[PDB]
Write a protein that binds this DNA or RNA. Structure first.
Ligand SMILES: Nc1nc2c(ncn2[C@@H]2O[C@H](COP(=O)(O)OP(=O)(O)NP(=O)(O)O)[C@@H](O)[C@H]2O)c(=O)[nH]1
Ligand code: MET
Ligand SMILES: [Mg+2]
Lengths: 22, 83, 409, 254, 69
RNA sequence: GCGGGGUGGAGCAGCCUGGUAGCUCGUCGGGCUCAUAACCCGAAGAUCGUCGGUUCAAAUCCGGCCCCCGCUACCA
């Protein structure tokens, strides 16, 4: 679980933060 | 960048416990990457799968799906046969 | 050196290259072996001499060598100028290199096939790319007239004379050829001598040039002691370079620091200059040049600094990541077999920004009426404020021209 | 011409012979260590029998019978122990590093491979050793090891210059650079590393360094001596890197 | 598949192929390399230059250029 | 530019370390079986890319010159 979520949250964050940074 | 096109045979197959599988054969192993293609296709089908020699195999009937996904990627509608 | 750069545009297999064979005698190679079985793929290149038989009758007076005894009589044809071609490919998706090529051109020749239904997907796509960019010196050509009825190459000349009407192309003259057997080519030479005139370029201007190839002269196995330098391949547009001038490339190579990205200018000296198969000491616009260098050929192998631009060392050129395009759109997608209407631009979308000879991709942050700001991946060296640009999208797996405009700094 | 200092081999000795004619009930062998001394080999002593009974594959044996009277010898290749089949197989390549030297020197001097085996190889036999290791001390140390034993001073220098042929060894290196005059720094860091190399790891034959890709290069040390391969090639490749790294020219082995 | 011609004019293809798929891929050959594009005669010469071969009919007089292979 | 291969018709071993050219198939003949090239037997057939050297002797070791396929790359 919290492994999952942390990396899902991180990937969401990055990918989206990539989309914001871009 | 490159090009290359090939004759594509798609059909239902057979695996162990569990359902049938879908074979996609007939891609040019020099030019085309079955490993990049197949990662893309397992995403479309949502099935596990592999590159089995010069073929991609996808667990379950995905035959209309894949042809519809292969033609999108810029492959010829006229080289593809679902059997 | 060649005085001027002429395109040969058109649809796939309409015989653009075969018409560069019948004028220059030079084949593009048709290479990569995959081009030897496909067709031309990297930008071809070929030069020749255009004299004129003064002592005889035109168009057959228009020679290729110093030899007039071919037509009328001997009086060795006064040399008018030396020229060079740039053969773009004809296949739909090799759109992104033909655009790239079009940053170098002073004029063009549209090769339509006499044995196919006239407005063919790329024939048009190219044409409006021409009308867009500003290459207003066009000559249309009807190529394969050796395999058709004498009615058929006329009825098509109707279809061309009617398309070429509401568009800008007034008397853009349609010279039927047969690139295969090299018949009626000297009348094409009379066209290109009249209509595609040699422009004036001010040499005092800031040295600027584009790059579209670059090659490792080193054969498989030249020893270290005579390791000749790396070779950048491209065309001067403004100025004139000289042998033994200090220089820089832009945006230049990027570094890697743990996932970071950072391009930077490379410096070197001009080791040698050459045009055709003959080495020169200086170089001027019109023609594609090549510049022997003293930088590591590993840097310029396959065609690594493709899209880059060369300038004076210690010059003033912005290396932008983010850019303000003023722009306009085609009402259709003249390119696809299908004419589906160009949608209006959406933010956070991927588009293929051709600027100069570089073919970059980039993401759209802002969308006004006609002013968009585009973040990029690989930077762009913006040598002026008069940078024409071209705007494509991925419509259906294959990249398509949809709008154009100018670069604003 | 390996001449011997005897008439018949002593009985129960091991030596290299060459098969000569394949007959029905045996086979005449030439005992290469005895002036090609024709002996007999029957089947009771052999043991797929067509590659060791080959018209002249050079097989090793034990001498069963030496009838001194008539002059005829029998041999067996069953009665060679396999702990007698290796050390008299290393003794073969030393006795055919010698054969060659006296097969080209006697020729060059224009004399005889008999007067080359009687003078050189039968007077460096008194000097405790196989006559190819009384010359391996000679070519390295001096011609006073040949004179000591009384090897006539006509063979002495034609020996030492016909004894001391190629071996080819290579390596994939990667020369990446960003210097304005990078090509020149490559040529430099290769002509400074491929330097004083003809006298360090000493008299090797040639060194070639070349582009087989763009950044990928092959180096090529050919040498007379096989273990005068890596030694040298590796010192060159170690100095490539070092002289590559000191001068801002990025080098590394594949 | 691989093959070479015998010493009396016979193709020995090293792969056992049915007696049909050789006709279908021997007709296609005819279509791309012998049948002229003007009157469909089969009565043609095959030109070769640098990198452009031509089908030359002995009846009408035209030339069908072919991808050189 | 380096390789990699070239051998009965065909697939190819053998070439390192030279010493009557092997295999599988096909063919062809006969035989065995009720009838099968299923098996048993035999024959035919490669001067081993090419040209030359070295060697007593080479398909082998050696070097020029070709024929297909990996490596390279349109070489300003
Ligand atoms: N009969 C005839 N054949 C021609 C003529 N011109 C070219 N061809 C043939 O058509 C084929 C294609 O020619 P090519 O020049 O490659 O067409 P292209 O449009 O330049 N190809 P690319 O898109 O790569 O630039 C060649 O094999 C050539 O022999 C012509 O005038 N008449
Ligand atoms: C195609 S490179 C452009 C011209 C160059 N000097 C040669 O060729
Ligand atoms: Mg072409």
């Amino acid at each position: 679980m919290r492994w999952k979520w942390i990396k899902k949250r991180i990937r969401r964050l990055k990918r989206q933060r990539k989309k914001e940074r871009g | 960048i490159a090009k290359e096109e090939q004759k594509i045979k798609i059909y239902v197959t057979k695996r162990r416990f569990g359902k049938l599988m879908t074979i996609i054969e007939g891609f040019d192993t020099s030019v085309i990457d079955l490993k990049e293609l197949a990662k893309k296709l397992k995403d479309i089908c949502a099935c596990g799968g592999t590159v089995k020699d010069n073929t991609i195999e996808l667990q379950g009937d995905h035959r209309k799906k894949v042809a519809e996904e292969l033609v999108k990627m810029g492959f010829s509608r006229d080289s593809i046969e679902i059997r | 050196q060649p005085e001027v750069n002429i395109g040969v545009v058109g649809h796939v297999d309409h015989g653009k290259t075969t018409l560069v064979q019948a004028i220059t005698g030079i084949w593009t190679s048709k290479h990569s072996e995959e081009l030897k079985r496909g067709m031309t793929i990297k930008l071809g290149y070929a030069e020749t001499n255009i004299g004129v038989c003064e002592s005889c009758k035109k168009p057959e007076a228009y020679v290729t060598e110093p030899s007039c005894k071919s037509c009328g009589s001997d009086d060795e044809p006064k040399f008018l100028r030396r020229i060079s071609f740039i053969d773009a490919p004809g296949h739909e998706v090799l759109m992104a290199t033909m655009l790239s090529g079009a940053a170098l051109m002073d004029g063009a020749i549209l090769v339509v096939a006499a044995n196919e239904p006239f407005p063919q997907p790329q024939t048009r796509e190219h044409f409006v790319a021409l009308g867009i960019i500003g290459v207003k010196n066009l000559i249309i050509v009807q190529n394969k007239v050796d395999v058709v009825s004498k009615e058929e190459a006329l009825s098509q000349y109707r279809q061309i004379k009617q398309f070429t009407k509401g568009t800008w192309a007034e008397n853009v003259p349609i010279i039927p050829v047969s690139a295969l057997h090299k018949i009626n080519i000297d009348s094409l030479i009379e066209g290109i001598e009249e209509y595609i005139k040699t422009p004036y370029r001010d040499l005092s201007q800031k040295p600027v040039m584009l790059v579209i190839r670059s090659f490792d002269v080193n054969k498989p196995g030249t020893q270290f002691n005579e390791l000749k330098g790396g070779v950048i391949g491209g065309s001067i547009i403004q100025g004139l370079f000289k042998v033994d001038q200090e220089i820089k490339v832009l945006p230049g190579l990027r570094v890697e620091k743990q996932g970071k990205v950072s391009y930077e200018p490379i410096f070197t000296k001009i080791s040698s200059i050459r045009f055709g198969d003959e080495e020169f000491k200086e170089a001027k616009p019109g023609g594609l040049v090549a510049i022997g260098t003293y930088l590591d050929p590993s840097l310029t192998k396959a065609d690594n600094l493709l899209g880059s631009i060369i300038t004076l060392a210690d010059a003033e050129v912005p290396v932008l990541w983010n850019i303000r395009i003023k722009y306009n759109l085609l009402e259709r997608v003249v390119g696809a077999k299908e004419m589906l209407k160009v949608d209006p631009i959406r933010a956070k979308e991927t588009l293929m920004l051709s600027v100069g000879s570089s073919t970059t991709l980039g993401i759209v942050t802002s969308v006004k009426k006609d002013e968009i700001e585009v973040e990029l991946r690989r930077p762009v060296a913006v040598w002026s404020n008069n940078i024409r640009t071209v705007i494509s999208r991925q419509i259906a797996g294959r990249w398509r021209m949809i709008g154009w405009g100018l670069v604003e700094i | 011409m390996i001449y011997s200092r005897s008439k018949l081999p002593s009985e129960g000795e091991i030596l290299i012979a060459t098969v000569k004619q394949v007959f029905d009930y045996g086979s005449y062998v030439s005992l290469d260590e005895y002036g090609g001394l024709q002996a007999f080999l029957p089947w009771s002593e052999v043991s797929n029998i067509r590659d060791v009974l080959k018209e002249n594959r050079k097989v090793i044996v034990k001498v069963i019978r030496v009838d001194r009277r008539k002059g005829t010898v029998d041999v067996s290749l069953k009665k060679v122990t396999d702990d007698e089949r290796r050390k008299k197989n290393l003794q073969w390549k030393k006795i055919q590093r010698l054969d060659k030297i006296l097969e080209l020197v006697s020729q060059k001097l224009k004399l005889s491979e008999k007067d080359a085996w009687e003078q050189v190889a039968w007077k460096l036999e008194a000097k405790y050793g196989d006559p190819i290791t009384a010359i391996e001390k000679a070519v390295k140390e001096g011609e006073k090891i040949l004179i000591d034993a009384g090897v006539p001073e006509i063979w002495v220098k034609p020996l030492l210059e016909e004894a001391s042929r190629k071996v080819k060894m290579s390596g994939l290196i990667t020369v990446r650079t960003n210097e304005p005059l990078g090509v020149e720094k490559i040529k430099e860091v290769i002509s400074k590393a491929l330097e004083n190399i003809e006298q360090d790891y000493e008299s090797l034959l040639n060194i070639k360094i070349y582009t087989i890709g763009a950044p990928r290069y092959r180096v090529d040390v050919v040498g007379t001596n096989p273990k005068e391969a890596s030694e040298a090639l590796n010192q060159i490749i170690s100095n490539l890197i070092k002289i590559g790294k000191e001068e801002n020219v990025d080098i590394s082995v594949v | 598949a691989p093959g070479n011609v015998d010493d009396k004019g016979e193709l020995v293809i090293q792969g056992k192929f049915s007696s049909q798929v050789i006709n279908t891929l021997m007709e296609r050959f005819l279509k791309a390399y012998v049948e002229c594009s003007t009157c469909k005669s089969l009565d043609t010469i095959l030109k070769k230059e640098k990198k452009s071969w031509y089908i030359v009919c002995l009846a009408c007089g035209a030339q069908t250029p072919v991808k050189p292979l």
